[PDB]
C-alpha cells in the first residue's frame, strides 16, 4: 500500500480557484499499472466540473515522472511517449504479469531509499529539455479537460433530468477518430497512443531551419534584423558558439550574413536560433546564404 501527503498533479487538472477542498481515502483503489492498492484523493476541479481522482500510485508516478491523474509530463506536459522521444529515453519497464510485479516490487524498495524530491533514474539523467519539447509544450491551461462526459440519454434524447443531465448534452464524437480510444495502460506505457503520433507529426511539420547542400556555403543569412542590432551584437549571438569568420550587417535590407569558422558551430547556432534568436525582440530568420 502507498501513503501520501497530497496528490502530485498538473496545474491544469488541479483547478482554477486558489482555494480547493479535497478528500482522501486510505487504501481506496488499485493502481491501474502498479496493480497494488493506493490512497485516492478526490477534488472538485471547478464550478460545474467533474470531480477528478488520482488514478495511479505515487511510485508509479515518481518512476515515470507524470501527474497522477492528468498523466502528462510534469515540466513540459506532453504525452509520455513524446517526452520520452524528446529526451531520447528508452524506458525498460516490464510488461508480462510476473516480471512486472517483480520489477514493481524492487523499484518500490529502491525508491523507498529516496528523498521524495525528484524522479528516480534516467528521469534525472534526461532533464536536458530539447527545443522540440519546449516547442510542443502547452502554454495556458487547457481546462476543457474537466468538463463532464457525453449524456447517452441526451445523445438519444432521453436526458429528462432537465438541465442536470450528468453529462455534456452535446454531439457524440465520431468513434473513427484516432483521438477517441486511448486505453490507460498504453498511455502509461507509451505504446501506440494516437495523441502521441498526431503531436509527433505536428512537431515534424513545425518550422525548423533547413540545411544547405554544399559544404562551402558557410555564409548564414539571418532575415529580419532591424537597426537596433550591432555587428558586435550579432557577434555575441554567434561568437562563443564556435568561431565566426565575418559578419555583414546589411542595413539596406535589415538582414545579416555570418561567415563562420566551423560548419557544425554555425549549424548548431542557426538551427538552435531558428526564428527563436530573440535578441532585442527581433524575429531573425536563420538560413544558409547563397
Amino acid at each position: 500500500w502507498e501513503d501520501a501527503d497530497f496528490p502530485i498533479l498538473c496545474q491544469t487538472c488541479l483547478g482554477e480557484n486558489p482555494y480547493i477542498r479535497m478528500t482522501k481515502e486510505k487504501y481506496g483503489k488499485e493502481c491501474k499499472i502498479c496493480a497494488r492498492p493506493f490512497t485516492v484523493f478526490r477534488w472538485c476541479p471547478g464550478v460545474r466540473m467533474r470531480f477528478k481522482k488520482t488514478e495511479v500510485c505515487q511510485t508509479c508516478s515518481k518512476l515515470k515522472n507524470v501527474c497522477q491523474t492528468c498523466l502528462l509530463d510534469l515540466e513540459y506536459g506532453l504525452p509520455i511517449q513524446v517526452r520520452d522521444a524528446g529526451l531520447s529515453f528508452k524506458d525498460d519497464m516490464p510488461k508480462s504479469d510476473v516480471n512486472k510485479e517483480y520489477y514493481t516490487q524492487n523499484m518500490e524498495r529502491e525508491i523507498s531509499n529516496s528523498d521524495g524530491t525528484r524522479p528516480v533514474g534516467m528521469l534525472g539523467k534526461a532533464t536536458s529539455t530539447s527545443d522540440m519539447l519546449l516547442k510542443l509544450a502547452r502554454t495556458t491551461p487547457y481546462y476543457k479537460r474537466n468538463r463532464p462526459h457525453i449524456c447517452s440519454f441526451w445523445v438519444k434524447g432521453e436526458c429528462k433530468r432537465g438541465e442536470e443531465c450528468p453529462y455534456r448534452h452535446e454531439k457524440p464524437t465520431d468513434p473513427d477518430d484516432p483521438l477517441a480510444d486511448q486505453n490507460i495502460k498504453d498511455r502509461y506505457y507509451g505504446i501506440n497512443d494516437p495523441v502521441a503520433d498526431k503531436l509527433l507529426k505536428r512537431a515534424s511539420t513545425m518550422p525548423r531551419l533547413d540545411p544547405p547542400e554544399d559544404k562551402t556555403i558557410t555564409t548564414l543569412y539571418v532575415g529580419g534584423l532591424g537597426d537596433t542590432i550591432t555587428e558586435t551584437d550579432l557577434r555575441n549571438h554567434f561568437y562563443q558558439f564556435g568561431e565566426i569568420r565575418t559578419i555583414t550587417v546589411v542595413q539596406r535590407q535589415q538582414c545579416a550574413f555570418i561567415q563562420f569558422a566551423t560548419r557544425q558551430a554555425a549549424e548548431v547556432a542557426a538551427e538552435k536560433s531558428f526564428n527563436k534568436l530573440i535578441v532585442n525582440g527581433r524575429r531573425l530568420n536563420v538560413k544558409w546564404g547563397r
Binding site: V47, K156, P172
Partner: protein
C-alpha cells in the same frame, strides 16, 4: 502544514466560486498587497461583494411556482416547488438525433 481559520476559507472560496474573483491567498515572503485574483475587473466593478455578504443585486431571479397549502391532495409543492421558467422535457432534436444514431452506428 498550515493552520488557518474556518469561516474565512469558506468565505473566500465561495466568493471565488459564485463571483469569480477572490482575495489571493499567496502568503509571500515578499510583501504583496491585497489583490483580487481571477476576474479582477469583476471584483473592481462589483465592489468586492461576497456571496455571503448581503449586497444590492437587482438581478432577475428565475420565476418559480408556489403551492404551499398542504390540504390539497395533489396540491402541495411546498419545498419541492418546481421553477416556473423550467422546461417540461429534455431531448436532442432531429439533426443531432440522426447524427447521434450515425455515430452510435460508427461505433
Amino acid at each position: 502544514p498550515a493552520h488557518i481559520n474556518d469561516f474565512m476559507f469558506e468565505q473566500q472560496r465561495r466568493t471565488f466560486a459564485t463571483y469569480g474573483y477572490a482575495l489571493d491567498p499567496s502568503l509571500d515572503n515578499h510583501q504583496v498587497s491585497a489583490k483580487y485574483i481571477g476576474s479582477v475587473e469583476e471584483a473592481e466593478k462589483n465592489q468586492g461583494l461576497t456571496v455571503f455578504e448581503t449586497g444590492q443585486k437587482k438581478t432577475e431571479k428565475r420565476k418559480k411556482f408556489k403551492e404551499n397549502d398542504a390540504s390539497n391532495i395533489d396540491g402541495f409543492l411546498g419545498p419541492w416547488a418546481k421553477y416556473v421558467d423550467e422546461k417540461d422535457v429534455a431531448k436532442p432534436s432531429e439533426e443531432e438525433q440522426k447524427e447521434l444514431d450515425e455515430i452510435t452506428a460508427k461505433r
